[PDB]
RNA sequence: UAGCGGCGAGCGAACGGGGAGCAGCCCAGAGCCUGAAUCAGUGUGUGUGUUAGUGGAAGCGUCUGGAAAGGCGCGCGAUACAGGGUGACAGCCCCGUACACAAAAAUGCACAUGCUGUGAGCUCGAUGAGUAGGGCGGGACACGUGGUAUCCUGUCUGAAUAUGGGGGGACCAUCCUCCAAGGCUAAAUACUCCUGACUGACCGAUAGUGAACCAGUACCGUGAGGGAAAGGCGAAAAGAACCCCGGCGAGGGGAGUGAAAAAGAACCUGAAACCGUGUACGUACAAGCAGUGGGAGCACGCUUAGGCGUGUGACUGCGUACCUUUUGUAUAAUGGGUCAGCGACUUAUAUUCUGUAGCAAGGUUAACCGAAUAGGGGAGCCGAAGGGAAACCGAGUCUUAACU
């Protein structure tokens, strides 16, 4: 039968033009008042999944 | 496509038990034991093709020593003498001559002595 | 290119891409292996430990008797037990890319030509559905082991050929790769050529 | 060429591994599974994404976005597609008929991809700046 | 995929598109014309299936052999060379097979027709209430109460009546669409205790059914229930008349049959463990994984000597089995009494990578049709475009008021 998407992964990663994955930074959900504005600024933009983690993400998203 | 193994297996066991001929008890009768016996036989044999070259040289030396001492010189000096005389006859041949041509062996001792004198 | 007609001493104009191309052996192989596999019926099975008859009773208690622990009288370790990876009916057919199919045919026809195994004639028929007549015609033509390919089905010819083991008859529409190979010679009528050509673009 | 003189291309039918068939084969005994532990077992191994218990990467990180139902009925058209429609007039219908966009597409954009070498009349389609320059260069027409 | 989801593990649509098949009716009612289409039960007719059957081509010589279907020679049939049997392998010996045929009787299905019954078309009507809706508790919908439409209802309630009502995923307006609370309906779909025919890169007696065999037996169990082992003389019984030892034994030796008894009924082949008789060599002052390296002697063959083959092995150097598990095992750790047979990385579908082949900015079709491994079918899928959460812009895009 068809492989099943790990559906929670599919709500956190998106495949980019050269085959990597973009994702949202952790730590910008709450407990924000104490966090420097600088630090939070740099968590806003999306980031790329690291080399160590691509195997894991790709395993979870066979149809990405 | 069901495969029966008897013909192949039988040939395999027979090839081993044949190499176990002469061995005692289960070693020449019972596959499991014969197989281990044939392996150990190869192991020793591998080992002993190296050892054989050691034991024979050890034999030659011992006889050269005896024949050298009969002519009044020790193996070690006899060898040194021959080396200094540029004599290159090896120890297999020297041990043969020690036994079969006592007069030539003595002549070799005189050549050794001269080169040491 | 042009194919010399055996006894009309005439020529027939055919596509060089069909009858004149190089032999692609790997291509031909894949299609004939696929054809043979497509002929498989695939009907069989054996019984798993689940399908052998008997009950789920543990043959003896787990500890204490000194026997190896057991669990099922249908264990595949056991005589009368299930087959570990028991078989099921399977479908052995393979996909062959349409283009790889036609390409294979083209390569085959081109070797036949190149090996002088392809023979072209205007007509090929017999006057009655009598095996003896076909046999006779074949002797006169110095043919024995042969595939006859005609433009339209010919009934007499078909019937006359059926009991001849070294002979098969076929309309252009029904040719196949392994038949084109499996006979010494292949005889085709002009019409059959004209139709095979159309078929192989 | 006979049924017993055909062989496959070198390297096209590599042989399968067969584990557990003795020392010489190189895959005997443990069958390349090493010694013990979960991964050596029949049926043994952990699921996709499992990291040992640590909050895994696809839970560590936050969800983002929503899905636009509109994106899915919106298609892009290449310049190379404009000649492939029968009639030199490009509409939603025309493009559907020529099998370039899906049947349920309700909006489309001609983008600068490939080229157009024939006058075309695009209509009811959005056109990118570049594409408009390319379509018009080749004598074409754009209209709402 | 969209979604659902301790948004975990998992669960998983529909719109729309391609196909198989296709069929539409009745009541909620009285009149008029009236047995008018339809269905069913059923007589008769023809047709045609099933349950017995009938015919069904063509070879002889020679050699080997116990026997010819085999070898060799020359013939012949074939819409029949599918298969089986026959003293070894048979188109032509036998049974068949291709093809052509056949039913007194019962029965299937079909058109036709009689019959009892059923009612046709017409006009004017009528239009499903404890229902829809709602509160409470549950359940079903991919949808777990969620912002949750739709469905069912255990409990309490409860409408409007075509100027009316439902739905369009909370809800409202607009618009579009449909008409609940009555019923029937063939095909395409699911299956195989059974019957006939045919087939298999399925098994071939520890396999294949548990069961090739008097097996759901023997046997076990109070019972539910559990549940075996076990095929092969030979072409033909020609299955050994007769004689001898023996208990009017068992068993054997002759005779005879047979190609063979190197087929004698425990019967084809007849492996291995295991046990004997015989011969060669060694062995009763000698210590250990039993071999290996050196090596006398004896026996037996050579070569016609040549200090070589084979068997044995006094004496001598070295030498603590295998598997497993371990940092490490001669280990006094595990496992195996031995032999023979069996016994463990498969299969299906997804997915990615490598190798290989085809075609190439294209590649490929799926169900299905089929002229059936062809051809048709391009519904789809992947790819040639990305960026952005998205609208959207697009070789760019996003970020930000804007980016050096
Ligand atoms: Mg926030
Ligand atoms: Mg022996
Ligand atoms: Mg050692
Ligand atoms: Mg079985
Ligand atoms: Mg096809
Ligand atoms: Mg494999
Ligand atoms: Mg292990
Ligand atoms: Mg470990
Ligand atoms: Mg491990
Ligand atoms: Mg399409
Ligand atoms: Mg499902
Ligand atoms: Mg449809
Ligand atoms: Mg239709
Ligand atoms: Mg006959
Ligand atoms: Mg015989
Ligand atoms: Mg109503
Ligand atoms: Mg309702
Ligand atoms: Mg909320
Ligand atoms: Mg109704
Ligand atoms: Mg049946
Ligand atoms: Mg059995
Ligand atoms: Mg047997
Ligand atoms: Mg008797
Ligand atoms: Mg006789
Ligand atoms: Mg006798
Ligand atoms: Mg016997
Ligand atoms: Mg003694
Ligand atoms: Mg002792
Ligand atoms: Mg330890
Ligand atoms: Mg040690
Ligand atoms: Mg031990
Ligand atoms: Mg033990
Ligand atoms: Mg064994």
């Amino acid at each position: 039968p068809k492989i099943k998407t790990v559906r929670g992964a599919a709500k956190r990663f998106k495949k980019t033009g050269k085959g990597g994955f973009k994702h949202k930074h952790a730590n910008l959900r709450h407990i924000l008042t104490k966090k420097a504005t600088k630090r939070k600024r740099h968590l806003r933009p999306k980031a790329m999944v690291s080399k160590g983690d691509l195997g894991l993400v790709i395993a979870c998203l066979p149809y990405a | 496509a069901r495969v029966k193994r008897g013909v192949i297996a039988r040939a395999r066991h027979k090839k081993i038990l044949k190499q176990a001929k002469g061995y005692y008890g289960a070693r020449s009768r019972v596959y499991r034991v014969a197989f281990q016996a044939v392996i150990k036989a190869g192991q020793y044999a591998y080992r002993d093709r190296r050892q054989r070259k050691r034991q024979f040289r050890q034999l030659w030396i011992a006889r050269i020593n005896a024949a050298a001492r009969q002519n009044g010189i020790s193996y070690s000096k006899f060898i040194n003498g021959l080396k200094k005389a540029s004599v290159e006859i090896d120890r297999k041949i020297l041990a043969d001559i020690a036994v079969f041509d006592k007069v030539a062996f003595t002549a070799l001792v005189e050549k050794a002595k001269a080169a040491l004198a | 290119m042009e194919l010399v007609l055996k006894d009309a001493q005439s020529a027939l104009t055919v596509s060089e891409t069909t009858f004149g191309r190089d032999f692609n052996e790997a291509l031909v192989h894949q299609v004939v292996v696929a054809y043979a596999a497509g002929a498989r019926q695939g009907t069989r099975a054996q019984k798993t430990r689940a399908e052998v008859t008997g009950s789920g009773k543990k043959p003896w208690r787990q500890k204490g008797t000194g026997r190896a622990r057991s669990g099922s009288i249908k264990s595949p370790i056991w005589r009368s037990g299930g087959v570990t990876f028991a078989a099921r009916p399977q479908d052995h057919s393979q996909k062959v890319n349409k283009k790889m199919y036609r390409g294979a045919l083209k390569s085959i026809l081109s070797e036949l030509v190149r090996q002088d195994r392809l023979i072209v004639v205007e007509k090929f028929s017999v006057e009655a559905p009598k095996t003896k007549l076909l046999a006779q015609k074949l002797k006169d033509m110095a043919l024995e082991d042969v595939l006859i390919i005609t433009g339209e089905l010919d009934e007499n010819l078909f019937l006359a050929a059926r009991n001849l083991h070294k002979v098969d008859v076929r309309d252009a529409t029904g040719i196949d790769p392994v038949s084109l190979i499996a006979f010494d010679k292949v005889v085709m009528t002009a019409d059959a050529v004209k139709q095979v050509e159309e078929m192989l673009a | 060429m006979r049924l017993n003189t055909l062989s496959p291309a070198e390297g096209s039918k590599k042989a399968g591994k067969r584990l557990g068939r003795g020392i010489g084969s190189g895959l005997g005994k443990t069958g390349g599974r090493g010694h013990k532990g979960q991964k050596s077992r029949s049926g043994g191994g952990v699921r996709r994404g499992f990291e040992g218990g640590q909050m895994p990467l696809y839970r560590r990180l936050p969800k983002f976005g929503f899905t636009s139902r509109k994106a899915a009925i919106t298609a892009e058209i290449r310049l190379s597609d404009l000649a492939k429609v029968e009639g030199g007039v490009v509409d939603l219908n025309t493009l559907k008929a020529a099998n370039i966009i899906g049947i349920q597409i309700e909006f489309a954009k001609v983008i600068l991809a490939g080229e157009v070498t024939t006058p075309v009349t695009v209509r009811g389609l959005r056109v990118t700046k570049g594409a408009r320059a390319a379509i018009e260069a080749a004598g074409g027409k754009i209209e709402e």
Side-chain angles (χ1 to χ4, degrees), chain C residues 35 41 43 53 79 84 98-99 102 130 162-163:
Chain C
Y35 188 93
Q41 196 171 275
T43 54
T53 306
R79 163 185 188 283
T84 308
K98 293 188 199 183
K99 272 169 190 167
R102 300 199 276 265
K130 304 253 72 187
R162 197 158 57 174
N163 219 33

Short mmCIF file of all heavy atoms in Angstrom, two decimals, chain C residues 35 41 43 53 79 84 98-99 102 130 162-163, chain E residues 78 80-81 199-201 210 344 364 373 375 378:
data_model
loop_
_atom_site.label_atom_id
_atom_site.label_comp_id
_atom_site.label_asym_id
_atom_site.label_seq_id
_atom_site.Cartn_x
_atom_site.Cartn_y
_atom_site.Cartn_z
N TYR C 35 7.89 -11.39 -22.66
CA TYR C 35 6.84 -12.13 -23.37
C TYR C 35 6.66 -13.53 -22.79
O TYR C 35 5.55 -14.04 -22.67
CB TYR C 35 7.17 -12.24 -24.85
CG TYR C 35 6.05 -12.81 -25.71
CD1 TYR C 35 5.16 -11.98 -26.32
CD2 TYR C 35 5.89 -14.17 -25.88
CE1 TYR C 35 4.12 -12.48 -27.10
CE2 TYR C 35 4.87 -14.68 -26.66
CZ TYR C 35 3.97 -13.81 -27.26
OH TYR C 35 2.92 -14.26 -28.06
N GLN C 41 1.28 -18.69 -15.83
CA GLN C 41 -0.06 -18.74 -15.25
C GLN C 41 -0.01 -18.32 -13.78
O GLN C 41 -0.89 -17.64 -13.29
CB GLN C 41 -0.61 -20.16 -15.39
CG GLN C 41 -2.09 -20.28 -15.18
CD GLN C 41 -2.61 -21.67 -15.54
OE1 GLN C 41 -2.90 -21.96 -16.70
NE2 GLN C 41 -2.72 -22.53 -14.56
N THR C 43 -0.19 -20.01 -10.98
CA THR C 43 -1.15 -20.62 -10.07
C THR C 43 -0.54 -21.66 -9.16
O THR C 43 -0.16 -22.71 -9.62
CB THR C 43 -2.27 -21.26 -10.84
OG1 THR C 43 -1.72 -22.17 -11.80
CG2 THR C 43 -3.05 -20.21 -11.57
N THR C 53 -3.56 -27.47 8.93
CA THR C 53 -4.62 -27.96 9.81
C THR C 53 -4.08 -28.52 11.10
O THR C 53 -3.07 -29.22 11.12
CB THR C 53 -5.44 -29.03 9.12
OG1 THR C 53 -5.91 -28.51 7.88
CG2 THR C 53 -6.63 -29.42 9.96
N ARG C 79 8.39 -31.12 11.09
CA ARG C 79 7.80 -31.93 10.06
C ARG C 79 6.28 -31.72 10.10
O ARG C 79 5.72 -31.57 11.17
CB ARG C 79 8.20 -33.40 10.26
CG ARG C 79 7.36 -34.43 9.54
CD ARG C 79 7.80 -35.82 9.93
NE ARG C 79 7.13 -36.82 9.10
CZ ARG C 79 5.88 -37.17 9.30
NH1 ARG C 79 5.20 -36.59 10.27
NH2 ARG C 79 5.30 -38.05 8.50
N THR C 84 7.61 -21.70 5.62
CA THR C 84 7.97 -20.42 6.21
C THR C 84 7.54 -19.20 5.43
O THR C 84 6.98 -18.26 6.00
CB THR C 84 9.46 -20.34 6.40
OG1 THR C 84 9.91 -21.49 7.11
CG2 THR C 84 9.79 -19.13 7.23
N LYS C 98 5.61 0.69 -24.72
CA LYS C 98 5.20 0.61 -26.12
C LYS C 98 6.34 0.82 -27.10
O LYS C 98 6.50 0.07 -28.07
CB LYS C 98 4.12 1.63 -26.42
CG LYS C 98 2.82 1.38 -25.72
CD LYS C 98 1.76 2.37 -26.25
CE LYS C 98 0.59 2.47 -25.28
NZ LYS C 98 -0.48 3.36 -25.77
N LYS C 99 7.13 1.85 -26.86
CA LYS C 99 8.20 2.19 -27.78
C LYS C 99 9.30 1.15 -27.75
O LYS C 99 9.96 0.89 -28.75
CB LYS C 99 8.76 3.55 -27.44
CG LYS C 99 8.01 4.65 -28.13
CD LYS C 99 8.38 6.01 -27.60
CE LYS C 99 7.43 7.04 -28.15
NZ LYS C 99 7.59 8.30 -27.39
N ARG C 102 7.97 -1.87 -29.93
CA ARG C 102 8.09 -1.68 -31.36
C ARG C 102 9.54 -1.67 -31.77
O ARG C 102 9.91 -2.32 -32.73
CB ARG C 102 7.39 -0.39 -31.76
CG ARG C 102 5.90 -0.41 -31.41
CD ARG C 102 5.09 0.60 -32.19
NE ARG C 102 5.16 1.90 -31.54
CZ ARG C 102 4.25 2.37 -30.68
NH1 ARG C 102 3.17 1.66 -30.35
NH2 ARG C 102 4.43 3.59 -30.15
N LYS C 130 -5.89 -28.60 -46.55
CA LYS C 130 -5.22 -29.90 -46.48
C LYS C 130 -3.74 -29.75 -46.13
O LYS C 130 -2.97 -29.21 -46.91
CB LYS C 130 -5.36 -30.64 -47.80
CG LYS C 130 -6.78 -30.84 -48.24
CD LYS C 130 -7.24 -32.28 -48.07
CE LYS C 130 -7.42 -32.64 -46.63
NZ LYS C 130 -7.70 -34.10 -46.49
N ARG C 162 -1.69 -26.48 -39.06
CA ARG C 162 -1.83 -26.67 -37.62
C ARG C 162 -1.08 -27.89 -37.11
O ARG C 162 -0.52 -27.85 -36.02
CB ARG C 162 -3.30 -26.76 -37.24
CG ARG C 162 -3.55 -26.55 -35.78
CD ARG C 162 -4.98 -26.12 -35.56
NE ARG C 162 -5.91 -27.10 -36.11
CZ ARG C 162 -7.22 -27.03 -35.96
NH1 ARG C 162 -7.77 -26.02 -35.30
NH2 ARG C 162 -8.00 -27.97 -36.48
N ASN C 163 -1.06 -28.96 -37.90
CA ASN C 163 -0.47 -30.22 -37.47
C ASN C 163 1.01 -30.30 -37.84
O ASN C 163 1.71 -31.26 -37.45
CB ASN C 163 -1.22 -31.40 -38.09
CG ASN C 163 -1.39 -32.57 -37.13
OD1 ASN C 163 -1.52 -32.41 -35.93
ND2 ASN C 163 -1.38 -33.77 -37.69
P A E 78 -4.98 -36.83 -45.42
OP1 A E 78 -6.37 -36.50 -45.81
OP2 A E 78 -3.86 -36.52 -46.35
"O5'" A E 78 -4.67 -36.10 -44.05
"C5'" A E 78 -5.64 -36.05 -43.02
"C4'" A E 78 -5.06 -35.39 -41.79
"O4'" A E 78 -3.80 -36.00 -41.44
"C3'" A E 78 -4.72 -33.93 -41.93
"O3'" A E 78 -5.87 -33.11 -41.82
"C2'" A E 78 -3.71 -33.73 -40.81
"O2'" A E 78 -4.34 -33.68 -39.55
"C1'" A E 78 -2.93 -35.03 -40.89
N9 A E 78 -1.74 -34.91 -41.76
C8 A E 78 -1.68 -35.18 -43.10
N7 A E 78 -0.49 -34.97 -43.64
C5 A E 78 0.28 -34.55 -42.56
C6 A E 78 1.62 -34.17 -42.45
N6 A E 78 2.47 -34.15 -43.46
N1 A E 78 2.10 -33.79 -41.25
C2 A E 78 1.25 -33.80 -40.23
N3 A E 78 -0.05 -34.14 -40.21
C4 A E 78 -0.48 -34.50 -41.42
P A E 80 -5.49 -30.75 -37.75
OP1 A E 80 -5.22 -29.73 -36.72
OP2 A E 80 -4.59 -30.91 -38.93
"O5'" A E 80 -5.64 -32.11 -36.95
"C5'" A E 80 -6.18 -32.13 -35.63
"C4'" A E 80 -6.23 -33.53 -35.08
"O4'" A E 80 -7.13 -34.35 -35.89
"C3'" A E 80 -4.89 -34.26 -35.07
"O3'" A E 80 -4.80 -35.08 -33.91
"C2'" A E 80 -4.98 -35.13 -36.32
"O2'" A E 80 -4.11 -36.25 -36.30
"C1'" A E 80 -6.45 -35.52 -36.29
N9 A E 80 -7.04 -35.97 -37.56
C8 A E 80 -6.93 -35.43 -38.81
N7 A E 80 -7.61 -36.09 -39.72
C5 A E 80 -8.20 -37.13 -39.03
C6 A E 80 -9.04 -38.19 -39.43
N6 A E 80 -9.46 -38.40 -40.69
N1 A E 80 -9.45 -39.04 -38.49
C2 A E 80 -9.03 -38.87 -37.24
N3 A E 80 -8.25 -37.92 -36.76
C4 A E 80 -7.87 -37.07 -37.71
P C E 81 -4.25 -34.45 -32.54
OP1 C E 81 -4.02 -35.53 -31.56
OP2 C E 81 -5.14 -33.32 -32.20
"O5'" C E 81 -2.82 -33.84 -32.90
"C5'" C E 81 -1.82 -34.63 -33.54
"C4'" C E 81 -0.44 -34.39 -32.97
"O4'" C E 81 0.49 -35.35 -33.55
"C3'" C E 81 0.15 -33.00 -33.26
"O3'" C E 81 0.89 -32.54 -32.13
"C2'" C E 81 1.12 -33.27 -34.40
"O2'" C E 81 2.20 -32.37 -34.51
"C1'" C E 81 1.61 -34.67 -34.05
N1 C E 81 2.14 -35.32 -35.24
C2 C E 81 1.27 -35.72 -36.25
O2 C E 81 0.05 -35.62 -36.11
N3 C E 81 1.82 -36.20 -37.37
C4 C E 81 3.15 -36.28 -37.51
N4 C E 81 3.64 -36.78 -38.64
C5 C E 81 4.04 -35.86 -36.50
C6 C E 81 3.49 -35.35 -35.39
P U E 199 -5.32 -29.68 -20.91
OP1 U E 199 -4.42 -29.94 -22.06
OP2 U E 199 -5.59 -30.69 -19.86
"O5'" U E 199 -4.72 -28.45 -20.10
"C5'" U E 199 -4.34 -27.27 -20.76
"C4'" U E 199 -4.01 -26.17 -19.79
"O4'" U E 199 -5.13 -25.95 -18.90
"C3'" U E 199 -2.86 -26.39 -18.84
"O3'" U E 199 -1.60 -26.18 -19.44
"C2'" U E 199 -3.15 -25.36 -17.76
"O2'" U E 199 -2.81 -24.06 -18.23
"C1'" U E 199 -4.67 -25.43 -17.67
N1 U E 199 -5.14 -26.30 -16.59
C2 U E 199 -5.07 -25.79 -15.31
O2 U E 199 -4.64 -24.68 -15.05
N3 U E 199 -5.50 -26.63 -14.34
C4 U E 199 -6.00 -27.90 -14.49
O4 U E 199 -6.35 -28.51 -13.48
C5 U E 199 -6.04 -28.38 -15.83
C6 U E 199 -5.63 -27.57 -16.82
P G E 200 -0.27 -26.81 -18.82
OP1 G E 200 0.72 -26.60 -19.92
OP2 G E 200 -0.51 -28.13 -18.20
"O5'" G E 200 0.10 -25.88 -17.59
"C5'" G E 200 0.46 -24.52 -17.79
"C4'" G E 200 0.70 -23.84 -16.48
"O4'" G E 200 -0.42 -24.13 -15.60
"C3'" G E 200 1.95 -24.28 -15.74
"O3'" G E 200 2.51 -23.20 -15.02
"C2'" G E 200 1.43 -25.29 -14.75
"O2'" G E 200 2.24 -25.40 -13.60
"C1'" G E 200 0.06 -24.72 -14.41
N9 G E 200 -0.89 -25.73 -13.97
C8 G E 200 -1.45 -26.70 -14.76
N7 G E 200 -2.23 -27.51 -14.12
C5 G E 200 -2.17 -27.06 -12.81
C6 G E 200 -2.81 -27.58 -11.67
O6 G E 200 -3.58 -28.53 -11.60
N1 G E 200 -2.49 -26.86 -10.55
C2 G E 200 -1.64 -25.77 -10.55
N2 G E 200 -1.44 -25.21 -9.37
N3 G E 200 -1.03 -25.27 -11.60
C4 G E 200 -1.34 -25.97 -12.70
P A E 201 3.56 -22.20 -15.69
OP1 A E 201 3.09 -20.81 -15.50
OP2 A E 201 3.89 -22.69 -17.02
"O5'" A E 201 4.83 -22.27 -14.74
"C5'" A E 201 5.39 -23.51 -14.35
"C4'" A E 201 6.83 -23.35 -13.93
"O4'" A E 201 7.65 -23.09 -15.10
"C3'" A E 201 7.14 -22.20 -12.99
"O3'" A E 201 7.00 -22.58 -11.65
"C2'" A E 201 8.59 -21.87 -13.30
"O2'" A E 201 9.44 -22.76 -12.60
"C1'" A E 201 8.69 -22.21 -14.78
N9 A E 201 8.59 -21.06 -15.70
C8 A E 201 7.62 -20.96 -16.65
N7 A E 201 7.74 -19.92 -17.42
C5 A E 201 8.89 -19.30 -16.98
C6 A E 201 9.55 -18.14 -17.39
N6 A E 201 9.14 -17.35 -18.38
N1 A E 201 10.67 -17.81 -16.76
C2 A E 201 11.11 -18.59 -15.77
N3 A E 201 10.58 -19.71 -15.30
C4 A E 201 9.45 -20.01 -15.94
P G E 210 -2.43 -30.09 5.93
OP1 G E 210 -3.01 -28.88 6.55
OP2 G E 210 -1.00 -30.16 5.56
"O5'" G E 210 -2.80 -31.39 6.76
"C5'" G E 210 -1.94 -31.87 7.78
"C4'" G E 210 -2.39 -33.24 8.23
"O4'" G E 210 -3.67 -33.13 8.91
"C3'" G E 210 -2.64 -34.25 7.14
"O3'" G E 210 -1.47 -34.92 6.75
"C2'" G E 210 -3.64 -35.20 7.78
"O2'" G E 210 -2.95 -36.09 8.66
"C1'" G E 210 -4.47 -34.25 8.62
N9 G E 210 -5.70 -33.78 7.98
C8 G E 210 -5.95 -32.50 7.59
N7 G E 210 -7.17 -32.34 7.12
C5 G E 210 -7.74 -33.58 7.28
C6 G E 210 -9.04 -33.99 7.01
O6 G E 210 -9.98 -33.33 6.54
N1 G E 210 -9.21 -35.33 7.32
C2 G E 210 -8.26 -36.13 7.85
N2 G E 210 -8.63 -37.39 8.06
N3 G E 210 -7.04 -35.76 8.13
C4 G E 210 -6.86 -34.47 7.82
P A E 344 13.40 -22.68 6.01
OP1 A E 344 11.99 -22.55 5.62
OP2 A E 344 14.27 -23.33 5.04
"O5'" A E 344 14.06 -21.25 6.21
"C5'" A E 344 13.28 -20.07 6.35
"C4'" A E 344 13.94 -19.15 7.32
"O4'" A E 344 14.21 -19.86 8.53
"C3'" A E 344 15.28 -18.60 6.91
"O3'" A E 344 15.11 -17.47 6.09
"C2'" A E 344 15.91 -18.26 8.24
"O2'" A E 344 15.36 -17.03 8.72
"C1'" A E 344 15.40 -19.39 9.12
N9 A E 344 16.33 -20.53 9.21
C8 A E 344 16.60 -21.51 8.29
N7 A E 344 17.48 -22.39 8.70
C5 A E 344 17.81 -21.97 9.97
C6 A E 344 18.71 -22.44 10.95
N6 A E 344 19.48 -23.51 10.80
N1 A E 344 18.77 -21.75 12.11
C2 A E 344 18.02 -20.67 12.24
N3 A E 344 17.18 -20.12 11.38
C4 A E 344 17.11 -20.83 10.27
P U E 364 7.76 6.95 -23.64
OP1 U E 364 8.40 5.66 -23.98
OP2 U E 364 7.13 7.77 -24.70
"O5'" U E 364 6.67 6.65 -22.52
"C5'" U E 364 6.96 5.70 -21.52
"C4'" U E 364 5.92 5.69 -20.42
"O4'" U E 364 5.78 7.03 -19.87
"C3'" U E 364 4.49 5.32 -20.81
"O3'" U E 364 4.30 3.92 -20.94
"C2'" U E 364 3.68 5.94 -19.68
"O2'" U E 364 3.77 5.17 -18.48
"C1'" U E 364 4.44 7.25 -19.48
N1 U E 364 3.87 8.34 -20.32
C2 U E 364 2.77 8.97 -19.80
O2 U E 364 2.32 8.66 -18.72
N3 U E 364 2.25 9.96 -20.59
C4 U E 364 2.68 10.38 -21.82
O4 U E 364 2.09 11.30 -22.39
C5 U E 364 3.83 9.67 -22.29
C6 U E 364 4.37 8.70 -21.53
P U E 373 -2.37 -11.17 -27.38
OP1 U E 373 -1.70 -11.65 -28.61
OP2 U E 373 -2.92 -12.10 -26.38
"O5'" U E 373 -1.29 -10.30 -26.60
"C5'" U E 373 -1.67 -9.46 -25.54
"C4'" U E 373 -0.46 -8.82 -24.92
"O4'" U E 373 0.20 -9.82 -24.10
"C3'" U E 373 0.57 -8.35 -25.93
"O3'" U E 373 1.28 -7.23 -25.41
"C2'" U E 373 1.51 -9.54 -26.04
"O2'" U E 373 2.82 -9.23 -26.48
"C1'" U E 373 1.51 -10.06 -24.60
N1 U E 373 1.80 -11.50 -24.48
C2 U E 373 2.88 -11.89 -23.76
O2 U E 373 3.60 -11.09 -23.19
N3 U E 373 3.08 -13.25 -23.71
C4 U E 373 2.32 -14.23 -24.28
O4 U E 373 2.62 -15.43 -24.14
C5 U E 373 1.22 -13.73 -25.00
C6 U E 373 1.01 -12.42 -25.08
P G E 375 1.48 -1.79 -29.97
OP1 G E 375 2.45 -0.98 -30.73
OP2 G E 375 1.28 -1.58 -28.51
"O5'" G E 375 0.03 -1.57 -30.59
"C5'" G E 375 -0.16 -1.15 -31.91
"C4'" G E 375 -1.63 -1.03 -32.21
"O4'" G E 375 -2.31 -2.27 -31.85
"C3'" G E 375 -2.37 0.03 -31.41
"O3'" G E 375 -2.23 1.33 -31.95
"C2'" G E 375 -3.80 -0.49 -31.46
"O2'" G E 375 -4.38 -0.27 -32.73
"C1'" G E 375 -3.57 -1.98 -31.28
N9 G E 375 -3.55 -2.33 -29.84
C8 G E 375 -2.48 -2.61 -29.04
N7 G E 375 -2.79 -2.86 -27.79
C5 G E 375 -4.18 -2.71 -27.77
C6 G E 375 -5.10 -2.83 -26.70
O6 G E 375 -4.88 -3.11 -25.51
N1 G E 375 -6.40 -2.59 -27.11
C2 G E 375 -6.77 -2.26 -28.39
N2 G E 375 -8.08 -2.04 -28.61
N3 G E 375 -5.93 -2.14 -29.39
C4 G E 375 -4.65 -2.38 -29.01
P G E 378 -7.76 9.30 -25.00
OP1 G E 378 -8.79 10.33 -24.74
OP2 G E 378 -7.27 9.04 -26.36
"O5'" G E 378 -6.52 9.72 -24.11
"C5'" G E 378 -6.55 9.54 -22.72
"C4'" G E 378 -5.49 10.34 -21.99
"O4'" G E 378 -4.29 9.56 -21.84
"C3'" G E 378 -5.07 11.66 -22.61
"O3'" G E 378 -4.95 12.63 -21.57
"C2'" G E 378 -3.68 11.37 -23.17
"O2'" G E 378 -2.82 12.49 -23.15
"C1'" G E 378 -3.17 10.32 -22.22
N9 G E 378 -2.22 9.37 -22.78
C8 G E 378 -1.06 8.99 -22.19
N7 G E 378 -0.44 8.05 -22.87
C5 G E 378 -1.27 7.79 -23.94
C6 G E 378 -1.12 6.86 -25.00
O6 G E 378 -0.19 6.07 -25.20
N1 G E 378 -2.21 6.92 -25.86
C2 G E 378 -3.27 7.76 -25.71
N2 G E 378 -4.21 7.67 -26.64
N3 G E 378 -3.41 8.62 -24.74
C4 G E 378 -2.38 8.58 -23.89
#
